[PDB]
C-alpha cells in the first residue's frame, strides 16, 4: 500500500512525468524533543517524500557551513520511489578523508544525518534533485 502525498514542498507541485525539481533544506526529525545548555543529539532528514507513490529518483548533496562562511559538502545520497512502495534509500557516499569532526555522521539504514548540538559548524542541509519518471521508463 502507498497513498500519494507531497509535503516536502508546500508552495510548489511535484514534477510531471518526466521532469525534475530542485529542493533545498532539511527537517529536524526529533524537533519536539530538541526544541525543549546540555549538548543534545539532533537528527536531520533530507527533503525526501516517504509516500511520493510514483516512480522517481532523488539525488542529493549534503553540506554544512563553517564558522568562516565556507560550505563543506560532506556527502552524496540517492533514493528511489515506486508507485507501489514507500521511498527507499539506494546509496550514500562520504567525502574521504572525513572533512568534519565526529560530532556529525550519516546513518547507513536511513539516510538520516545525526549531529551533536556542540558542533563547530551549522545544521546539515540537502540540495536534492527530484526527477519523476515517465510511464514505463
Amino acid at each position: 500500500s502507498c497513498v500519494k502525498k507531497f509535503t516536502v514542498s508546500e508552495r510548489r507541485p511535484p514534477p510531471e512525468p518526466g521532469k525534475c525539481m530542485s529542493l533545498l533544506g532539511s527537517t529536524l526529525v526529533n524537533k519536539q524533543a530538541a526544541n525543549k545548555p546540555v549538548t543534545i543529539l539532533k537528527i536531520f532528514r533530507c527533503p525526501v517524500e516517504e509516500y511520493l507513490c510514483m516512480n522517481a529518483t532523488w539525488s542529493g548533496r549534503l553540506f554544512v557551513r563553517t564558522q568562516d562562511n565556507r560550505e563543506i559538502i560532506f556527502g552524496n545520497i540517492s533514493f528511489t520511489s515506486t508507485d507501489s512502495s514507500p521511498t527507499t534509500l539506494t546509496g550514500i557516499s562520504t567525502l574521504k578523508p572525513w572533512p568534519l569532526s565526529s560530532d556529525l555522521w550519516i546513518h547507513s539504514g536511513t539516510g538520516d544525518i545525526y549531529m551533536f548540538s556542540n558542533a563547530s559548524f551549522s545544521d546539515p542541509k540537502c540540495y536534492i534533485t527530484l526527477c519523476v519518471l515517465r510511464k514505463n521508463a
Binding site: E10, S22, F121
Partner: protein, 124 residues
C-alpha cells in the same frame, strides 16, 4: 525613544528577537505573531550587518520574505514587493527566504530553521 522588551536587541527604529528553536517558515511566522511582532523585514545592509555581528551566525534564520502564490512574486510579509539586496541561488529550490551566514538564500518552506522576529515603530 521607545522602551524595547526584555532580552530583545535594539537597533534604530526596531526591536529584535533571535529564536533558539528551529521550525518551518509558517510556524516561525505564527511564533512572531504570538509575541506581537513580525518576521524580520531587512531595511538595509547596515541592519543586516548589525545582526550578523551580534548573532551562531553560520546557521540559517527565517526572514519575513517568501514567494507568495497569490501574487506569483517574492514579497515581504508587509506587502512590499522584493527588489535588488539579492536572493542567492543557482536554481529555484524553495519559496521561503532566510539569512544564510551573510547572504540571503531561498530554501524550502517545510525546512526547519531558527528565525528573527522584529517590533518596529509606526507612530504615537
Amino acid at each position: 525613544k521607545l522602551e524595547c522588551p526584555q532580552d530583545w536587541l535594539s537597533h534604530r527604529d526596531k526591536c529584535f528577537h533571535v529564536s533558539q528553536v528551529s521550525n518551518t517558515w509558517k510556524e516561525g511566522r505564527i511564533d512572531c505573531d504570538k509575541k506581537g511582532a513580525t518576521l524580520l523585514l531587512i531595511q538595509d545592509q547596515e541592519e543586516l550587518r548589525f545582526l550578523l555581528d551580534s548573532i551562531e551566525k553560520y546557521n540559517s534564520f527565517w526572514i519575513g520574505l517568501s514567494y507568495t502564490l497569490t501574487d506569483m512574486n517574492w514579497k515581504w510579509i508587509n506587502g512590499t514587493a522584493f527588489n535588488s539586496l539579492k536572493i542567492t541561488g543557482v536554481t529555484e529550490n524553495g519559496s521561503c527566504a532566510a539569512i544564510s551566514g551573510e547572504k540571503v538564500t531561498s530554501e524550502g518552506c517545510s525546512s526547519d530553521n531558527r528565525w528573527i522576529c522584529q517590533k518596529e515603530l509606526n507612530g504615537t
